[PDB]
Every structure is written in structure tokens, then in C-alpha cells.
Amino acid sequence: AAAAAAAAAAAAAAAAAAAAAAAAAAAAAAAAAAAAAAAAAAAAAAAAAAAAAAAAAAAAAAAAAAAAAA
Amino acid sequence: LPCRVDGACDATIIKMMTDLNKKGIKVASVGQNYLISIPASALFADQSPRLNWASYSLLNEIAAFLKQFRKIAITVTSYSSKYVSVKRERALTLARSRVVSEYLWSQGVDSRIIFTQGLGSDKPITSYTLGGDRSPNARVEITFRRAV
Amino acid sequence: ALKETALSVGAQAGLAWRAKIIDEQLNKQARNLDAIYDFNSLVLEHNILPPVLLEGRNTLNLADAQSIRISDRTYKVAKQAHFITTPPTWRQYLWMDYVKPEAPKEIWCIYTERGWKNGIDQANTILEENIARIKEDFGGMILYRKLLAMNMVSPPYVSHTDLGVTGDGSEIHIDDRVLRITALPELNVNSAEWRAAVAK
Amino acid sequence: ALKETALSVGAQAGLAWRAKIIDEQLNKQARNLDAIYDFNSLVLEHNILPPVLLEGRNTLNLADAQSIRISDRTYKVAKQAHFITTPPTWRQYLWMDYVKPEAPKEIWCIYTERGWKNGIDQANTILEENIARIKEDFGGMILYRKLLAMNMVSPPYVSHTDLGVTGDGSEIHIDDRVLRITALPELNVNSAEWRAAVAK
Amino acid sequence: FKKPPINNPSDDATIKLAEAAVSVSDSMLEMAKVEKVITPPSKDNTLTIPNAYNLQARASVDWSGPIEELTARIAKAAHFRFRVLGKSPSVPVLISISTKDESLAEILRDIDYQAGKKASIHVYPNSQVVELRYA
Amino acid sequence: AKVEKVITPPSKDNTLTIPNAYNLQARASVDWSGPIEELTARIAKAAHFRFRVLGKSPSVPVLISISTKDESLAEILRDIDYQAGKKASIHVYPNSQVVELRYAKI
Amino acid sequence: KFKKPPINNPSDDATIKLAEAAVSVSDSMLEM
Amino acid sequence: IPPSANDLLLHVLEGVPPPGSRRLVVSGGDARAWLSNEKMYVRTNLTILSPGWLASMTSADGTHAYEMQKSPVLLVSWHGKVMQLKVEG
Amino acid sequence: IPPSANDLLLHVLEGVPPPGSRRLVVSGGDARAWLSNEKMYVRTNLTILSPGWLASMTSADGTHAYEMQKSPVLLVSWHGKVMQLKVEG
Amino acid sequence: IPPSANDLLLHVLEGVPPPGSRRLVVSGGDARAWLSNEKMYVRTNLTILSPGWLASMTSADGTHAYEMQKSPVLLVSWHGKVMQLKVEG
């Protein structure tokens, strides 16, 4: 975690963790600016998986068939 | 899962920060404004816009130190002591800073802008004016603000 | 039969693995693909997404034994121009879907390798159609800007009905501009005002 | 499944513990929050609680493919001005509820820690919406006092029908003043008498 | 010793992808060259900053609405007279100024700009009058 | 691009309206994909130009995406002006020190 | 040894978002 | 005549959720998202780029509020960086 | 009056399949084939010789798109060489 | 025309409960509270601040009597101190 500066003093929300020297590089909350650039989901960047289906194919909520996840 | 560390650790930040201050590249750390100050003896040849080959290792832990922070704009600005004129001097320091920022975005920064410029001893940090690139005035400085 | 379900085990694992490899292979070229598929500076003056025109040169249809129709060029307006808020990226068109499949002798091993390459090249055909769809859509907008220069289509005619302060006393909107598209971009058949692409 | 009910044991205990910690963390800043959310000296002349105005600048609605509406600013009157007896504190808006839950291996321990942080940040989102609601309500009253200066709303028009001694002989009320609100505070659309916030 | 670039095209397909990237990015630029039409600053039609010492007072405005009221108060904040010439239409011409410190003549510059051609602003600084015409 | 630049000739540049300056001849390298005004505010901050805005910025953002390496700040502002075609324009007044972003009338 | 100057007490999330609300209501207040 | 905006964008221009909602957790960026009736609403100060929104407002301090259809990933610009945000629900 | 062409040849003049299709794998040559409704469509730049096609278009770069009935073998010319392509489906 | 007050505030301006009531115990302050019909009535000489009351009277000696809805906590001022009172029922 916040290693060798000191121990982690606070955990500043809308930020990362706050070490007892400076601001750390370890993310405190879920809602910090963590560099997500590769998602992992069925029918991401179209609309989400329309959950009511029970068949072979996986249909998105924008009515595309997720053929990469069927 | 979301990531805890962003490809960096604080122990490695202060490990590079002690090692750069031991090799004489002085890291000032004010707020989130970070300054690394590099003497122009430690990178280039004298009154030249040309790197030495061994000084890219010095640029290696400069760039691997610049891996560690989330940053928006690095500005790199260079200035040396007087050699012929201020016009020749400002051409030298502009070429000087643009060469070291060309290597720094050849290497890894996650900066969105590197601004890069040179000045004609217009901001000198000591009044003692010994010589050329062996002056402690003759330096490049890499300043940025660490974002969040 | 066990050999067949060994192939079916290998197929979806090869598909998801190939999907993974080309997802960060896409993300390695992320700024390059924003340069290629730059829809952002292809939009029109009132942030209107341009329509996708399709060119087909030198066309024959054999209708029956008695008759053919040739035409020299065919331009089709597909998925007509419309008000876009934020322009499309390449990531709606190119990103294949990553799920991590958690569902698991000698004939099993050789057909899970042939299932593995079947999943790999079937993911390759999905990616090939994704590149095909973005090349259709983007080059259709490019084909508009050719024909908008070349006077074979109309530009869209917007109308901004400006309104002043609007509403009752529980709700006001101060500068209330309603923007409509009246005339859609649309190929003219009155063909004497056309242009021709002569350069030097 | 036992792991799932271990998580569900840890959730409500973490919620109630986080509720406790932020309750006396609120009570440590009790006079500071009376300074921040001072509704008491925001009320009007006849102890009328001011209404909550909502500002939304620079608004688009994409209605369909054919039409958008932009407006530059939107002011909404939400939960209109009314006779308050005693002004609201922050404690109706911010105080989360403390009950002490008296309802109780290795997988149990690790998922009661992940249940414990799930209860902690779910109590944090409840507190975040509580702060959000008081910031809406208070800054809406502040946005009134802006627009009451800035002539975009009416002030409320009270009417005091004074009555003298009132009743039969079994019951008298001596100085019997009936106070009504006739005109509610209300955004004017006749917009030429508006103001503009120019300072130095 | 130095290094190649990290996200370098040092691969025989990624080179063709990135030479295509610089070809479409500059072909995007010469597109933006041919349709981006300017007006010269000799013929820009907008206001120029009228360099009077009352107009270089630092001010602070948050508003949207009908132009005459900001220009009336920007005149009496500037200690200037305010004249109007022309007829205000029934739909008023609506501005939006939101700065929390910016100088006063530049507040007249972006009201002249957000007026555009429905109205415009002249300043005569020797007489100390600002003025708003219609069309 | 070939048929467009022949069927209307580009009449003029934008170096008439963004002229270069000593302290605008500092250089930068930039990848960028956000809205225009925060990038331009950073350009003018490191140019030591006061940055100002004419016109209210529209409801959809004016998005530019500049990806480049080592040119001058004047040509960065020029390519920013171009990639915001007919939605904004950069003006620079170099006898003053002001970079301006002008939004459009629509 | 490297240290930034203000090493205060450990705050918590409640006073973090109370302060973040409090500054915007102070700004709204101020401008009114 | 189109509708003006949604007036519930005034509420999600503040931090307060719409009445009768479902919370959506947002990862990898400073945004809050709620789902009222097959539409999510995002309070952010980032700039959403890819999946397209139906309505938008912006407060005094540059906070925006967006009405959009439910997409499980949001793409924003943070400060010129293209960024991803991930929503569950 | 005959029909003009099929307008879906514009789509298979690009690489994109027709909506509601079945993919056909093509061996022994650079072509892609889809089957929409008892008719296959071939994107190629080769020249199909033996089994006869019902409709054809050609793009700017010499890519052709052919509507034809389903035949399990295609005969093309590649560069004067008579060549065979084999389709499954 | 509104009603005047409740005339049963005259009774709870004295110490006497309303006819047909339920007693409410009050902790942490000098007040007495009764619940007549989904409304509580408080005899105090403190000043109730937070939850808001519907009617009030005051006797000769500064004793007040309040009609209000049933809230399980009362916030008063005692002598400038913000104070809490707790009622069961």
C-alpha cells in the first residue's frame, strides 16, 4: 500500500489514499480516477445484456446479438 | 476488478527520489508541484544541443520516475550561462529542451502535454557565474503538477 | 461424440482468448484509431452526423433470360443524417466482447486444439466484420463529403426557431432555441448542376 | 451459500457501525453545521420558508432524430414557499438512523470483512445523498435570494386580516389576526424587468 | 545507452496502421483547411477594447437575459451614459455572461459578440457613453 | 481532400488571425482528446497569454483531439482552430498578450 | 527522508464530503 | 414541439437521486449514476464521449448532469485522457 | 421493367454481411461469401467464371460483389490462372 | 377561515392531559407529552426547534403548550444550548 513514506494516514474521498508524508498512488475509493481502458463485459459499448432472454444467443439491450459471447 | 496501484508504488517513488538526489539531480517536492533540476553538465556537452550517450541512463530514471505520477502537462525548460549572445543562447536552450522532451516522449510519460522552452539566463539561481555548462545556473528543469 | 464435445469446449475458450488478445491489441493502437476513425471532425455544422453513402460502380442485374439492366454508378443513402450529441468512436464498432469463460484424453487434446483454432479464426471473422462495418460507415461519410463538394447531395437545412423566456412561473427556460432539420441530405436527380473531380 | 449469508451478516453490522461513527462525527461538528446550514436566517418576513429553486444551465434534449431543443438556463420552483413555524435544522436532513443490531469459518471471516466494507460504503452513499439533499434544499433557498434580488421571482404577498375580539361567550380570542399567503413566490416571464449580477 | 520508444511502431503491420494514421490526420487537416473560412481581423466587425481607465475596472457578472439591462448597468458601473438607438423586438435578444472576475470592456466585447448581428455595441470614450444599436 | 481543395480553393490561412510571437515560439508536444477550452487555457498559461472566451460554449462539447509531437504553440493553436472548424476559432492578439477562444453563433 | 509539511490528523469520509459540500455552499452564499 | 429537457436533470445536477430510483455504482471515475426508468442519469464533471446522451445540463461549477440510455460502460475525457467508467445495473 | 440491381450488393461491396445472413467459409482464394436467402453474395477481387452470377457491382479499387445462386464451388481467374474456390453451406 | 388554535392546548398549558390520551415518557428535559389522536402535545418551558409544531400557546409564567405530529425526538433550546428530548410512543 502506502509503503516506506510512512503508513497511510487518511483515506481522502474523491482521491487516492493519503500517506503520512504525501498523497499515495493506491486508490482509496471506487470512485477515484483509476485508468480503466479495457473493460470486460458482454455487449459493452453497445447497450448491456438484455437479461430476460433464455436461448442460445446473447442479445444486447440495443438489440444486437453479441456473437462474440454467445 | 478495479486496480489498487496504477503501475507505481510509493516506496519506488521515494527510492528513485533518494537515488536522484544522491546522483545530484535535485528533486523538489512542493505541494503537488514536482521539480527535478538537472545540471547541464550531467546531460549534455558544453554549449551544445547534443546529448552524451551515457546521459540517457540519467534520463532513464528521469523517465521511470515520470512513470509514477498522474500528470497533465510537464513543462521542460532549459537555460544556461552566457556564451556568445542571448539570441544564440536562447536558440541553444530551445533546442536543448526540445531535444530532451523528444527523448521524454520517446520514453514513457503519461503526460498529455509537454511544453518545452528555453531561456537566456533570464532566471539564474545563483549569482556566481563560473563558466559554461559547469555552472549550477546551467541547467534544465522539469516541472509538473501531480494530478489528484 | 466425446470428441465433438471436446471440440465444443475448445471453441469458446479460443474465441474468448482471441477476443482478449485483440482487445488490448486494439488498446495499444488507441490513439492511432482515433486518428483513423476520426468521426469527430467529420460532423456537420449543427453537430449533425453525416449520412452513409454507398457507391457501387459498374452494375449489372440479370433479371431473367430476356433482360438485363446495367447502370454505371449507384449511390445509396443508408442510415440518413441526424443530430448527434457526441460523435461515434471506434470503440462501439470494433471492441469485441470479453467474458471470461469458467466452464470446463488424447483425442480430447487434438480436438481442443482444432477447437482452439476454430474459436480463433471465428473471432477473426467477427473482427473482420467489425472493421468492415466501421469502414462502411466512415467511408460513407467520406463519400458524402465528396458528393457535397461534388453537388450530388443536398446539405441538411436546419431551422432554428429562437424562443425567448419560456414557460409558466414554476419553470423558466431563458434562451429557448428549438433546432430542427427540415431538409435531409438527399441526392439530387436534376443532374446538370453536378460537379466532376478534376485535379492536377 | 453459507458464504453468501456470511456476507449478509457482515453488511448490516457494517452499515450500523458506519452510521454510528458518522453520527457522532456529525455531532462533533454540530455548531459548524448550524453555521453552514443556517436555515433560520434564510426565512422570509412572515416566517415563510423560502422555496427551492433549481438552476440548470446550458440544456439540451435530443427529442428524436429530427429535433433537439436547447435552452440556456432553466429555473424550476420545487417545493414552493410556505409558512414554517420553526426553521429546519440540518438534523432532519443529515442524521442517519442508529439501531443496534443484535442478530448474529475462514470463508465466513473473509466475506464478513467484504460484507463489512459493503455496509460501510453503502452507509457512505446514504450519507452522500443526505448531504446532496441538504445542498439542494439550502442552495435552492440561496438561489431564491439571488433571484429575488435579481427580480426573476415574486416575493410572497401576505395578507393579514386583523380581527378584533372573536367568538361566543364561552371562548374569546382577543387579538385575532389571520395571516394568509395570497401570491406565491413565482418566476416572472415578463422578462424586461430582470436584473443582472454585475459587481466590481 | 538509450531505448526504442515504448509504443513504437516497430512491427510490420502497426507501421502501416500508423503511416495511415498520419496520412488520415494530415488529410483531415487539409480538409479543415479548405472548409475553415475566417474573416480577417481588418474586417472582424466586433468591438475593440476601448482603452479607457473606467473601462479597465475588474468586474464580476453572472447572468443570462436581455442585453439592455446589462449594458445599462455596465454603463452606470463604468460611470458612463447609456444610449439606445433602434427598436427592441418582442423576442428579446438574450446574452449569457458568467465570469467571476473579468474586466469591464471585455464584458462589453462578449456582449457585442453574443449579440452578433441582432444588435451591436459602440463605445465613445471621450464623451463617456456606451451605446447599443439594433437593426 | 483532393476534390475539396480543388473545387473550392483555400483563399487564406489562419496565420493572419493567429500570428506568432516571441513567447509564443515556445514549443509543445500534445496528445489530447477533450474539450477545447481547457487545452487552450493550458496553451495560453504556458504561453503567458491571458486566455479569454467570447460566446457561450454549446451544450454538446466542442471536442478536439490533437495528437502530435514538437511543434510551436502558434501552430498548435492553429491546428486547434482547424480541428474546431465552424464551431470555434482561436484568435491571438500579440501586441497585447491574449489568446481568445471564440465559440459559434449557433 | 521526504515529507510534505501538513501532516494533520486522520480525517474520515464524512467530514471529507461535509467539507466538499460546505465549500460550494460558501461560494454560492458568497456570490449571493 | 419537443420537450425542453427533463426537469429531473435539475435534481441530478445536484447530487440527489431521482425519486424512485436504483443506485448504480460507478468505477474508475468521479461520477454518480442512478437509473429511474430504463434511463440512467449521471452526475459528473467529466465529459462523456462514446455512448451518447439524450439530455444534458451543467451547474455553475462545471458539474454536468446527463440523461442517457443504460450502457454498462461510459467513456469520458478526464483532462484530454480518454478514460473508462464502468457501471453495474 | 427489370429491377436495378440488388441494393444489398452495396453492402457486400463493402466487407459487411447482409442483415440476417449465414457466413460461408471460402477456401483457396481471397473471397468472402454470405448466404442471405437461398442466394450467396461474394466479395472478391477475383473474376468468377463458371457458375454464373445474377448481379454484380464493383467498388473503386476493383473489388467486386456478386449475387448468385448457391453453388459449392466457384471457379475464378486469379491472374490468368483458372482457380477453384470451395464454399461450405 | 382557519381554526383558531386547538382549545385543548388550554388543557395542556396546564399540566392536565387531554381526555382519552396516552402518556408519553420524556427523557432528557423538563417536558410532558401526551398523544391524543395521532398528534402529541407537549407541556414545556423549553423551546422546541427542529421537528415543527402545528399549534402553540403560552401561559403567564412562560410555560408553552405545543400541538405537533408524533416525532420520537424533540430538539429544544434550553438556555442557548441545543438539547435533545426523547419520547417513547
Residue numbers in the entry:
A (entry chain KZ): 1 to 70
B (entry chain KK): 41 to 188
C (entry chain KC), D (entry chain JC): 58 to 161, 173 to 268
E (entry chain KD): 25 to 159
F (entry chain Kd): 56 to 161
G (entry chain Jd): 24 to 55
H (entry chain KH), I (entry chain LH), J (entry chain JH): 273 to 361
Share the article's original sentences.
The Type IV Secretion System (T4SS) is a potent weapon used by some bacteria to infect their host and can deliver effector proteins into eukaryotic cells as well as DNA and/or toxins into bacterial neighbors. In the Gram-negative pathogen L. pneumophila, the Dot/Icm T4SS delivers ~300 effector proteins to the cytoplasm of host cells, in some cases causing Legionnaires’ Disease. Central to assembly of the apparatus are five proteins that define the core complex: DotC, DotD, DotF, DotG, and DotH. The map can be divided into two major regions: an outer membrane cap (OMC) and a hollow periplasmic ring (PR).
Using symmetry and focused refinement, we determined a 3.5 Å resolution map of the OMC disk and a 3.7 Å map of the PR. The OMC disk makes up the pinwheel-shaped portion of the T4SS and is organized into a thick central region with 13 arms extending radially outward. The disk is also thin compared to other structurally characterized T4SS OMCs and contains no distinct inner or outer layers. Within the disk, we unambiguously traced and identified DotC, DotD, DotK and DotH along with the protein Lpg0657 (Goodwin et al., 2016; Figure 2B, Figure 2—figure supplements 1 and 2). Notably, rather than an equimolar ratio, the components of the OMC exist at a ratio of 2:1:1:1:1 (DotD:DotC:DotH:DotK:Lpg0657). At the center of the OMC is an elongated fold that is comprised of α-helices and β-strands that we have identified as DotC (residues 58–161 and 173–268). On the peripheral side, DotC makes contact with two copies of DotD, which we have called DotD1 and DotD2. DotK contacts the C-terminal domain of DotD2, whereas Lpg0657 interacts with the N-terminal α-helices of both DotD1 and DotD2. On the periplasmic side of the OMC is another small globular fold that we identified as the C-terminal domain of DotH. Within the OMC disk we traced three poly-alanine chains that could not be unambiguously identified as any component of the Dot/Icm T4SS.
